[PDB]
């Protein structure tokens, strides 16, 4: 246990949709709102998880884990390096429906350690 430290940083980091030319729009370092109105319904986050997790949660409107509900899945998992080939984290991609969300924003939360659940920010957006 050295480079499998718990999740120490969670942030939405990039966002796009299928309708937005896959324009990943590098989010400001503490952004609270969208770059633009994301066209479409296939919402694509590219969120930075610095530290080990496989316990992602997204509560949706209904108040249940959407990634165990039906629509949202992780479907792509690259790697990231902290220069010295150190595995600082992996960019866990997700396929969220905009439609199933509680409000016009996206948010992720994940298990850091014990029962700490890092909440990402909220990123409010427009629907076409």
From Swiss-Prot:
Record bears the keyword Cytoplasm: no
Domain of life where this protein originates: Bacteria
Keyword Ligase recorded: no
Alphabetical keyword list: Signal
Name of the protein this chain belongs to: SPbeta prophage-derived uncharacterized protein YolA
Lineage: Bacteria, Bacillati, Bacillota, Bacilli, Bacillales
Name of the encoding gene: yolA
Full-protein positions shown: 29 to 155 of 155
């Amino acid at each position: 246990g050295a480079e499998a430290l718990p999740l120490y940083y969670l942030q939405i980091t990039g966002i796009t949709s299928d309708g937005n030319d896959f324009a990943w729009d590098n989010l400001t370092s503490s952004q609270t709102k969208a770059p633009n109105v994301l066209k479409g319904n296939k919402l694509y986050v590219k969120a930075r998880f610095m530290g080990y997790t496989k316990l992602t949660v997204i509560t949706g409107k209904d108040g249940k884990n959407l990634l165990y509900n039906g629509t949202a899945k992780m479907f792509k998992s690259d790697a990231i390096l902290g220069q010295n080939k150190v595995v600082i984290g992996w960019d866990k991609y997700f396929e969220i429906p905009m439609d199933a969300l509680q409000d016009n924003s996206i948010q992720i939360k994940a298990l850091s350690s014990g029962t700490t659940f890092v909440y990402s920010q909220k990123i409010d957006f427009e629907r076409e």
